[PDB]
Each structure stands twice: as structure tokens, then as C-alpha cells.
Design an enzyme around this catalytic site. Structure first.
Site, PDB file in Angstrom:
ATOM      1  N   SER A 259       0.804  -1.215   0.000  1.00 22.57           N
ATOM      2  CA  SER A 259       0.000   0.000   0.000  1.00 22.57           C
ATOM      3  C   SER A 259       0.843   1.274   0.000  1.00 22.57           C
ATOM      4  O   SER A 259       2.045   1.239   0.258  1.00 22.57           O
ATOM      5  CB  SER A 259      -0.979   0.011   1.177  1.00 22.57           C
ATOM      6  OG  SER A 259      -0.293   0.080   2.409  1.00 22.57           O
ATOM      7  N   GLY A 260       0.191   2.394  -0.293  1.00 22.70           N
ATOM      8  CA  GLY A 260       0.863   3.681  -0.314  1.00 22.70           C
ATOM      9  C   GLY A 260      -0.159   4.804  -0.296  1.00 22.70           C
ATOM     10  O   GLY A 260      -1.339   4.570  -0.019  1.00 22.70           O
TER      11      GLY A 260
ATOM     12  N   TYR B 238      -1.490   6.357  -2.698  1.00 19.76           N
ATOM     13  CA  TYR B 238      -2.487   6.239  -3.760  1.00 19.76           C
ATOM     14  C   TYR B 238      -3.377   4.999  -3.736  1.00 19.76           C
ATOM     15  O   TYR B 238      -4.305   4.894  -4.533  1.00 19.76           O
ATOM     16  CB  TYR B 238      -1.867   6.420  -5.145  1.00 19.76           C
ATOM     17  CG  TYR B 238      -1.673   7.865  -5.538  1.00 19.76           C
ATOM     18  CD1 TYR B 238      -0.436   8.485  -5.405  1.00 19.76           C
ATOM     19  CD2 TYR B 238      -2.734   8.617  -6.021  1.00 19.76           C
ATOM     20  CE1 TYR B 238      -0.264   9.811  -5.742  1.00 19.76           C
ATOM     21  CE2 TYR B 238      -2.572   9.946  -6.359  1.00 19.76           C
ATOM     22  CZ  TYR B 238      -1.334  10.537  -6.218  1.00 19.76           C
ATOM     23  OH  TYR B 238      -1.172  11.863  -6.551  1.00 19.76           O
ATOM     24  N   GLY B 239      -3.103   4.062  -2.833  1.00 20.98           N
ATOM     25  CA  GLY B 239      -3.977   2.910  -2.701  1.00 20.98           C
ATOM     26  C   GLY B 239      -3.348   1.690  -2.055  1.00 20.98           C
ATOM     27  O   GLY B 239      -2.168   1.684  -1.709  1.00 20.98           O
ATOM     28  N   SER B 240      -4.159   0.650  -1.890  1.00 18.27           N
ATOM     29  CA  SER B 240      -3.722  -0.590  -1.263  1.00 18.27           C
ATOM     30  C   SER B 240      -3.968  -1.717  -2.249  1.00 18.27           C
ATOM     31  O   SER B 240      -4.883  -1.636  -3.070  1.00 18.27           O
ATOM     32  CB  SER B 240      -4.539  -0.849   0.003  1.00 18.27           C
ATOM     33  OG  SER B 240      -4.544   0.286   0.849  1.00 18.27           O
TER      34      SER B 240
ATOM     35  N   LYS C  51      -6.444  -3.463  -6.577  1.00 16.71           N
ATOM     36  CA  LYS C  51      -6.071  -2.199  -5.957  1.00 16.71           C
ATOM     37  C   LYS C  51      -7.283  -1.374  -5.570  1.00 16.71           C
ATOM     38  O   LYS C  51      -8.152  -1.099  -6.395  1.00 16.71           O
ATOM     39  CB  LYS C  51      -5.141  -1.370  -6.848  1.00 16.71           C
ATOM     40  CG  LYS C  51      -4.946   0.046  -6.308  1.00 16.71           C
ATOM     41  CD  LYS C  51      -3.696   0.726  -6.841  1.00 16.71           C
ATOM     42  CE  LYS C  51      -3.782   0.975  -8.324  1.00 16.71           C
ATOM     43  NZ  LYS C  51      -2.556   1.656  -8.835  1.00 16.71           N
TER      44      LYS C  51
ATOM     45  N   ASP D 136       3.087  -0.623 -13.841  1.00 13.75           N
ATOM     46  CA  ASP D 136       3.621   0.283 -12.826  1.00 13.75           C
ATOM     47  C   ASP D 136       3.067  -0.097 -11.445  1.00 13.75           C
ATOM     48  O   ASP D 136       1.890   0.143 -11.155  1.00 13.75           O
ATOM     49  CB  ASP D 136       3.261   1.735 -13.158  1.00 13.75           C
ATOM     50  CG  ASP D 136       4.087   2.734 -12.378  1.00 13.75           C
ATOM     51  OD1 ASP D 136       4.269   2.535 -11.163  1.00 13.75           O
ATOM     52  OD2 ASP D 136       4.549   3.728 -12.972  1.00 13.75           O
TER      53      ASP D 136
END
Ligand SMILES: CC(C)(C)c1cc(NC(=O)Nc2ccc(Cl)c(COc3cccnc3)c2)[nH]n1
Length: 351
Positions: free
Chosen positions: A29-30, A32-34, A50, A165
Site C-alpha cells: 500500500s501507499g 495512492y492505494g492498497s 487495488k 507500474d
């Protein structure tokens, strides 16, 4: 029509997905999303899902979300990642707040291959062939990857390869700082912001990737932006006056001219033992002037790829309308644009 959703929490995040998807297990995760790995029971696939992190936070975010969805709905090529599915638990536009993207589950990246395996020249042929094949496709849609590196390349047990990506985070100044793989594969013009850049930035990355497959070592492991520029100019040589004019940044131009002038090195004495044809291809990839770099399409026909090249099976993308990039819209407008794309999605057929 609409499938049934069930809920579950995984790492302080609530997931609402259709029943078809089972055995959700967190993978990363980050900002911008999991992502969870999961088993899609309708298709038989191991899949990745995602969940976008507040996709409509701001104008710029909402547009980002719309952009990736459009992008992924469009990529339909063997060497490029595609969308299996996209969904929302929302029953109307009024309650649309969450977006989920479904893809094939990627296991090992190319970084894992070069790390843990010895590669034959024939391996390098097939691996670079597929990257170039996919890249021809991506470029013909006027998309630039901009962040090609081994970790963004998925490779299975048969050495079959997909470009994607994995990135889940902001691309900030801090991550590009220092001794970091994030910057080692970047074209120099996009690393020192020399000028308006183009497709060929990705070709430079393939150069760096190919070298590393041949040696098992990072080509330009700079300890920072300037150190890396020196490693690069040591190999390919300091720029001529022709290239200096094309550098828009007067300040960057000025720095380069302060450097001691150096000749291009002999690539056969760097890549000792490499196939002379691999050496030649690298020389046409690792060219400082981006105007003069070989293209993906051109590279496919190079003799290094003779075993694999097939001009009847190296397809281009359908026309890709990218006019939205120019439009300034409000959050709710990006949102509804996105919602239309969700509801219009048609899943791929398996053979
Ligand atoms: C230039 C190309 C077309 C290569 C490109 C691709 C992207 N972005 C993505 O690929 N995004 C994305 C979105 C959702 C998922 Cl699920 C995935 C794959 O994520 C995983 C994670 C763990 C294991 N397998 C797959 C990628 N931008 N530009």
C-alpha cells in the site's frame, strides 16, 4: 446485473468487493492505494485488486484516477498489463466514492530475476525483445512510461514479460535523492530537466536494463544526480555543441559546459564477452541526444532479435483519445467521467 458485495477490514482499511473474489491477502500500500492478492472464482485466476485511496480527494487526484482508469481500460497487449475488472460498491453516481482495479497477479519482477539467476544471451534476447514489443504498443498510443525499471517488469517462470507500474506513492524529490534505484534508469534529460522530453526516455531505460541483464550489475548506480550524470558522461561521452543548443535550461547547459570534455568509451571493453550484436544495440540505445536514439519499432528489427522478431505479431494500439489531459474540470466532473468509465467496462474474454 449487479453482483453481491461483502465487507472486510485489512490493515485499517475496509474492503468491499464482489463475492467472486476470495482469499484477499494484503500485498502492499501507499498514498495512492492498497493492493490485495485474491482468487477470482469466476475466471480461475490469481488476481491483484487495488483499492484507490480517496480517489476524489482533490481536482488533481480525481483527474489522476480518471487517467489511470482510461489508461488501463485501453492497454490490450500480451507484454503490457491489462484490466481484468473494475468495480464500485456504489449503486449510483451520488454515492460513488471508491474505485477498485483488478489485474492478473504479478509474482516476480525482473529485479528478482537478475538478482537470483544467471541469464544466457538468449535469455537477454527474449527479455528485451518483449519489453521493446510492449513499448512499441505503449508508444503508439502516445503514452510514455517514464519510470521503466526492473521492478516495474513482471516475469514468470517461462521468462514471459509484462510492463506495468507497481507504484503506489507520490513521485517526490526525496525519492529521487541519493543512492536509489528510482533514479538509476532515468534518461539524463528527464533527470536534470534539460528540455521537453519524449518517448525515447523509455528507450534509455531499456539501455540501462539490458546492460544490467548482461553484467548482472547496475549500469549507472549514481550516489546522486550529479554523480550519476558523471557515470553516464564517462561512458557515452560529454555532449557536442549540437546537443547543447537543444538544452532549454540555460542553467543546465551552463553546468555541462564546465565539465572536462570526454570521448565515448569502447562498449566492447565495458561489456566484456557480450554478443557483438548486443553491444551494437546498446550503442544505439544509450545515446545522449534523444532525437537520435533508436525507437522501439526500429529496435525490433535489429539483428540481435532475429530469433524472435515477427513483423506480423508486433501490434500497435487503437487510437487513444487523450484530449482530457488539456481540460480543466471540477472534482464532481472528473468523478462522473470516471463513473461512466466504470459502468461501461467490458471484461476481456479468455480463450
Ligand atoms: C505505461 C504502462 C501502460 C505500463 C502503465 C501502467 C500503469 N499503471 C498500472 O499498471 N497500475 C496498476 C493498477 C492496478 C493494479 Cl492491481 C496493478 C498491478 O498491481 C499488482 C500488485 C502486486 C502483484 N501484482 C500486480 C497495476 N501506468 N502506466
Amino acid at each position: 446485473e449487479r453482483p453481491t458485495f461483502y465487507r472486510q477490514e485489512l490493515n485499517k482499511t475496509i474492503w468491499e468487493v464482489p463475492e467472486r473474489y476470495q482469499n484477499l491477502s494484503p500485498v502492499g500500500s501507499g498514498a495512492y492505494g492498497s493492493v490485495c492478492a485474491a482468487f477470482d472464482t469466476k475466471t480461475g485466476l490469481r488476481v491483484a485488486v487495488k483499492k484507490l485511496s480517496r480517489p476524489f480527494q482533490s481536482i488533481i487526484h480525481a483527474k489522476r484516477t480518471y487517467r489511470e482508469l482510461r489508461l488501463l481500460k485501453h492497454m490490450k497487449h500480451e507484454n503490457v498489463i491489462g484490466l481484468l475488472d473494475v468495480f464500485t460498491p456504489a449503486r449510483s453516481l451520488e454515492e460513488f466514492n471508491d474505485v477498485y482495479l483488478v489485474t492478473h497477479l504479478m509474482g516476480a519482477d525482473l529485479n528478482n530475476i537478475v538478482k537470483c539467476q544467471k541469464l544466457t544471451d538468449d535469455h537477454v534476447q527474449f527479455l528485451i525483445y518483449q519489453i521493446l514489443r510492449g513499448l512499441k504498443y505503449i508508444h503508439s498510443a502516445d503514452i510514455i512510461h517514464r519510470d521503466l525499471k526492473p521492478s516495474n517488469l513482471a516475469v514468470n517462470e517461462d521468462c514471459e514479460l509484462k510492463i506495468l507500474d507497481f507504484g503506489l506513492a507520490r513521485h517526490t524529490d526525496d525519492e529521487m535523492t541519493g543512492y536509489v534505484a528510482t533514479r538509476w534508469y532515468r534518461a539524463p534529460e528527464i533527470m536534470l530537466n534539460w528540455m521537453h522530453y519524449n518517448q525515447t526516455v523509455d528507450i534509455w531505460s531499456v539501455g540501462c536494463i539490458m546492460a544490467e541483464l548482461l553484467t548482472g550489475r547496475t549500469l549507472f548506480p549514481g550516489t546522486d544526480h550529479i554523480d550519476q550524470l558523471k557515470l553516464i558522461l564517462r561512458l557515452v561521452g560529454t555532449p557536442g555543441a549540437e546537443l547543447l543548443k537543444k538544452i532549454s535550461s540555460e542553467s543546465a547547459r551552463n553546468y555541462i559546459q564546465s565539465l572536462t570534455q570526454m570521448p565515448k568509451m569502447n562498449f566492447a571493453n565495458v561489456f566484456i564477452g557480450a554478443n557483438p550484436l548486443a553491444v551494437d544495440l546498446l550503442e544505439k540505445m544509450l545515446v545522449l541526444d534523444s532525437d537520435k536514439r533508436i525507437t522501439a519499432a526500429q529496435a525490433l528489427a535489429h539483428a540481435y532479435f532475429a530469433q524472435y522478431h515477427d513483423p506480423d505479431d508486433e501490434p500497435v494500439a487503437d487510437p487513444y483519445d487523450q484530449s482530457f489531459e488539456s481540460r480543466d474540470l471540477l472534482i464532481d466532473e472528473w468523478k462522473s467521467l470516471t463513473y461512466d468509465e466504470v459502468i461501461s467496462f467490458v471484461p476481456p474474454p479468455l480463450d
